[PDB]
Write a protein that binds this ligand. Structure first.
Ligand code: AHR
Ligand code: CA
Ligand code: NA
Length: 1082
């Protein structure tokens, strides 16, 4: 429909930069610095009105056209220059491309009776300067109008006409011809031939493409004859540009952000034309385009004044959501003159079809004060914030072109180069300074370090500011021209020390928002402590600048400037400064989180403590929980409310069970005092679940102690009641190692785990080799297949021990104990056969309990436990068992997965509300089933279950964890009604007898933990389920992982698609959601 702005962010015109934080890596590069007094090729021979640039990319080179008069706008002479560059930093000297044209003596106007032209030079004015033809030829174009005095209009449509000439591959120009004649002008009374007279047949064809193209005719409306038939839309809307939307339609922008649409390539435009709603724009033009990443961007002055120069982003070319800085400086205007006004202005980029710069970034040409010519480069995909602190070695970079993390303001006479290891700042400019900004993650506690060297101590200045997102400097450090390194405390400064030329100084600055101070160390010695002169919430930028900041101009300055400044062409004596090894760090508790911040999710914990009473308090009370969470949890977000809420609830629930005991932390299952628990109310049944979920906690002291408390909490040794429940806890300890990477912790647990395995082996094998367990001792009393006081061979314990044997064998390889590897290796092989041969029911095609005489002939949730440890072959015969996930006669029920198949006669026939396992949904089981389903779908060639099927069950598991409208994780629930079956009894509250966040992280987000240094993800969120999602602040293998998906690129602004970040640096990428693997990035 129409271009519009919906962002809340505004630009404040009492500041030069608007209090807009810039986007990352924007380089401001001055191309032309006016100097009347010392005219030269490189400044267009001392002309001081230089304005209205145009840009194109052709044969790997930038082409930059600007126009100039000697001093005053619409005061002759007047010409148009051309400039080139391979990289966009180092430019060739301005070359006169359209020279001054003679107005015929005796020219007149209706609006100027009695006046008539004598020896009068034409004024030039184009809204459009370039065209790449279909045959790859580059045509540049200009217009000549007439001004009989300074108050006259040469874009009145009584002009002379429009000229063109070819720019050739070799640099040289072709001849100059007219392409359009204003009324009363023709071949007979003009100084260049008509374009058609050229004998270059293809040059004519190229010129003719411009006339035939209606999108170019839209840009001639201002200068051309009024009502000329070749102008598609005849109303005089100003400085047209346009771009192609994703659907093929063309959107347009003119001055004051007027905007339309065209569904026929530019012949017609949707009435009524109106301002883009929510945009802030005036005279100084707006520029929009598509970018290499397929998104869009607008560049404009968001102000009735012509400052700052800003960028707003859009994913669809219509709805613009952001507003940040491109150019916030304002060189003061050296040379006065007619209609010149302060600030960066007339932004204009590359039309569609006229070039793609090889680096894929956004380059935009603009003037400053109608005086100096500039270009800015903005890295695409455009990034707002720094995903990673500084650790910059400049010797790795050949030229500033490669410093995509630094923002650079670089005037001609205050340039920014590299000198190997050093980022260098030169300043011989009285009216300007060199400035570099380094944007970093917004931080409350901040350390910043770098080496600093001056080339002098008797001249110039350097200011070091520490800014927030609204450009508030919280303190400043200064190298003074009277030889001192000092800090700003308030109005008063503090002299920290003297300084010397040519000497490296290691500067470290330690800033704290909370404490509201800065400490400055130089060579390990503290040399200054002051308070902030201005308070901030966070610091996001360090700025190095070769000058004091400039107060002029302001919103109250008069727009017209009659004066030149004193010594306008002169120079300061050269000052140099150098910096190297810029490091930053933060002690903030979520500093490891690359994109998400805990403050945006702190509300979840707040809601949970407010929503209901705190019945039982153990080590971490509710009042400290929000805080514990910040320190310990990976952050997650997605567009779906329930999944997100559950993510934060299951950590907030889990933490209640961290319990203080004399021998260390332990992890409870019931909060209430159970009659049969061991010491400290501990229960062994779900230790597997506890470890699998708690391994993602970042502070290891909790899980370290919880484990040690089981195996060593009872006079040095194991707790007694590990004899009471079957265990997969050796697999679970090796599951922990796969997430934290800590060999030592694990290898230390090996004997304790061998003791355990061997105990179960002595006590609980039948004579054929299979393990037996009574259904009670699996934690599954009154199960259908069963066995209260029975020694049936249940696929639970048999699979748990397969897992344990497999685990201990691996611990053997890593121990260096090749005997233990083998011994437990064969224990693994053996149990794998006994399950595959003796427990596969061949009628049912399903793993099932074997009673003393034959199979129990009932499919239960336990029949999916062999895949919890990847027990089965990849053969197709087993795939069929997973069909029962999607069958309402099997396990598919309204609120998730049943514990037994629903088709069975005996399903849920042993009463209710006393913990029965003959059908009802048990989170314990559901989590075993989903972990196994995850393993199936990840590690097996497999056609039975889609992404959608996995997601469905996790979604149902989310929906099931509510009670009275609030989140709730109870013991067990009704498969049809969703009723938690102990009701409002206290004992079921916050029950810790399952996983959820392991499932979120390992199945859904699909971070697959491994023994080695490959990172493997494989989300089971289906294509198009969610426009974005992100798992951040994960402590995998002593490195900080972020995993994110951004369909349109507009959620995180770091690219489209799926991405892995290790410590905030990208490690891999994928256009869709599939398996994405990053080798050796740890
Ligand atoms: O069915 C739940 C039982 O009670 C819990 O204490 C144990 O985990 C399990 O044996
Ligand atoms: Ca200066
Ligand atoms: Na701001």
């Amino acid at each position: 429909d129409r271009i519009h702005y919906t962002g809340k962010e505004l630009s404040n015109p009492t500041y030069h930069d608007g209090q807009l934080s810039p986007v990352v890596g924007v380089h401001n590069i001055q191309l032309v610095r006016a100097n009347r007094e010392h005219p030269e090729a490189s400044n267009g021979n001392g002309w001081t009105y230089n304005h209205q640039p145009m840009l194109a990319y052709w044969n790997g080179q930038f082409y930059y056209q600007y126009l100039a008069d000697p001093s005053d706008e619409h005061v002759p002479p007047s010409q148009t220059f051309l400039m080139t560059s391979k990289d966009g930093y180092q430019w060739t000297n301005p070359e006169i491309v359209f020279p001054p044209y003679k107005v015929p003596d005796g020219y007149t106007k209706e609006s100027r009776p009695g006046m008539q032209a004598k020896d009068l030079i034409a004024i030039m004015h184009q809204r459009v300067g370039f065209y790449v033809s279909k045959s790859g030829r580059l045509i540049t174009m200009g217009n000549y109008g007439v001004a009989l005095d300074k108050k006259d209009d040469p874009n009145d449509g009584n002009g002379i006409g429009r000229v063109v000439r070819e720019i050739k591959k070799d640099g040289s120009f072709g001849p100059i011809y007219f392409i359009y004649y204003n009324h009363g002008f023709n071949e007979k009374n003009t100084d260049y031939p008509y374009f058609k007279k050229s004998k270059d047949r293809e040059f004519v064809k190229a010129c003719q493409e411009i006339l035939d193209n209606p999108l170019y005719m839209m840009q001639w409306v201002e200068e051309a004859d009024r009502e000329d038939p070749i102008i598609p839309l005849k109303k005089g809307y100003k400085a047209f540009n346009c771009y192609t939307l994703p659907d093929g339609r063309i959107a347009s922008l003119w001055k004051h952000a007027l905007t339309s649409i065209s569904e026929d390539g530019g012949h017609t435009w949707a009435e009524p034309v109106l301002r883009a709603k929510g945009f802030v724009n005036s005279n100084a033009k707006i520029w929009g385009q598509r970018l290499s990443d397929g998104t869009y961007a607008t560049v404009y002055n968001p102000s009735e004044f012509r400052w700052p120069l800003a960028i707003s982003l859009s994913k669809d070319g219509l709805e613009y959501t952001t507003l940040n800085l491109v150019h916030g400086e304002i060189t003061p205007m050296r040379y006065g003159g007619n209609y010149k006004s302060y600030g960066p202005q007339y932004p204009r980029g590359i039309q569609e079809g006229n070039g793609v710069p090889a680096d894929g970034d956004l380059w935009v040409s603009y003037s400053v004060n109608k005086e100096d010519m500039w270009i800015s480069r903005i890295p695409v995909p455009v990034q707002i914030n720094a995903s990673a602190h500084a650790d910059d070695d400049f010797s790795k970079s050949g030229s500033i072109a490669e410093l995509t993390n630094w923002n650079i303001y670089s005037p001609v006479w205050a340039p920014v180069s590299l000198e190997g290891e050093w980022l260098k700042l030169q300043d011989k400019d009285p009216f300007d300074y060199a400035k570099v900004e380094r944007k970093i993650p917004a931080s409350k506690e901040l350390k910043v370090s770098f080496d600093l060297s001056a080339g002098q101590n008797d001249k110039g200045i350097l200011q070091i500011d520490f800014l927030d997102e609204n450009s508030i400097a919280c303190s400043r450090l200064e190298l003074t021209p009277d030889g001192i390194f000092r800090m700003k405390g308030g109005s008063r400064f503090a002299n920290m020390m003297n300084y010397e030329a040519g000497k490296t100084y290691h500067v470290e600055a330690v800033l704290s928002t909370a404490d509201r101070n800065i400490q400055v160390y130089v060579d390990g010695k503290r040399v200054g402590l002051r308070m902030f002169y201005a308070p901030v919430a966070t610091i996001e930028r360090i700025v190095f600048r070769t000058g004091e900041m400039r107060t002029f101009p302001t919103v109250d300055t008069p727009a017209d400037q009659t004066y030149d400044l004193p010594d306008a062409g002169g120079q300061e004596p050269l000052a140099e400064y150098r910096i190297a090894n810029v490091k930053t760090s933060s002690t903030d508790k979520d500093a490891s989180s690359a994109f998400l911040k805990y403050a945006d999710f702190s509300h979840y914990a707040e809601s949970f403590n407010g929503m209901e009473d705190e019945n039982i308090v153990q080590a971490i009370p509710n009042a400290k929980a929000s805080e514990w969470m910040e320190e310990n949890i990976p952050l997650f977000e997605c567009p779906q409310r329930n999944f997100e809420e559950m993510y934060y609830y299951r950590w907030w629930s889990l933490r209640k069970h961290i319990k203080e005991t004399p021998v260390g932390y332990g992890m409870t299952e019931f909060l209430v005092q159970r009659s049969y628990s061991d010491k400290y109310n501990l229960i062994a049944c779900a230790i597997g679940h506890h470890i699998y979920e708690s391994r993602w906690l970042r502070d290891p002291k909790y899980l370290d102690q919880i484990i040690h408390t089981w195996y060593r909490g009872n006079d040095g040794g194991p707790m007694k009641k590990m004899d009471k429940f079957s265990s997969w806890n050796a697999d679970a300890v090796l599951a922990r190692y796969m997430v934290d990477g800590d060999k030592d912790f694990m290898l230390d647990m090996t004997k304790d785990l061998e003791t355990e395995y061997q105990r179960w082996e002595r006590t609980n094998r039948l004579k054929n080799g299979l393990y037996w367990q009574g259904d009670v001792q699996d934690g599954m009393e009154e199960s259908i297949s069963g066995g209260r006081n029975k020694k049936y061979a249940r696929p639970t314990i048999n699979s748990y021990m397969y897992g344990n044997a497999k685990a201990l064998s691996i611990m053997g390889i890593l121990s260096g104990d090749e005997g233990m590897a083998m011994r437990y290796g064969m224990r693994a092989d053996t149990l794998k056969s006994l399950v595959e041969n003796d427990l596969w029911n061949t009628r049912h095609q399903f793993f099932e309990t074997m009673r003393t005489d034959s199979s129990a002939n009932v499919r239960e949730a336990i029949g999916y436990i062999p895949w919890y440890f990847n027990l089965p072959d990849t053969t197709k015969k087993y795939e069929v068992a997973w069909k029962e996930i999607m069958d309402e006669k099997g396990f598919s029920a309204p609120y998730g997965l049943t514990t037994a198949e629903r088709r069975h006669p005996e399903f849920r026939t042993r009463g209710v509300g006393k913990c029965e396992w003959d059908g009802a949904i048990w989170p314990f089981a559901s989590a075993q089933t989903l972990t196994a389903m995850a393993n199936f779908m990840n590690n097996y060639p497999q056609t039975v279950l889609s992404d959608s099927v996995y997601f469905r069950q996790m979604e149902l598991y989310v929906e099931s964890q509510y009670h009275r409208g609030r989140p709730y994780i109870g013991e067990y629930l009704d498969e049809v009604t969703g009723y938690w079956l102990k009701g409002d009894q206290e004992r079921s509250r916050y029950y810790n007898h399952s996983t959820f966040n392991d499932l979120m992280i390992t199945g859904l987000i699909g971070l697959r933990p491994r023994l080695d240094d490959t990172i493997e993800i494989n989300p089971l969120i289906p294509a198009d389920k969610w426009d974005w999602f992100c798992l951040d602040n994960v402590l995998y293998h002593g490195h900080n992982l972020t995993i994110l998906w951004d369909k349109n690129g507009d959620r995180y602004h770091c690219g489209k698609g799926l991405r892995i970040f290790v410590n905030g640096k990208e490690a891999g990428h994928a256009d869709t959601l599939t398996r994405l693997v990053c080798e050796n990035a740890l």
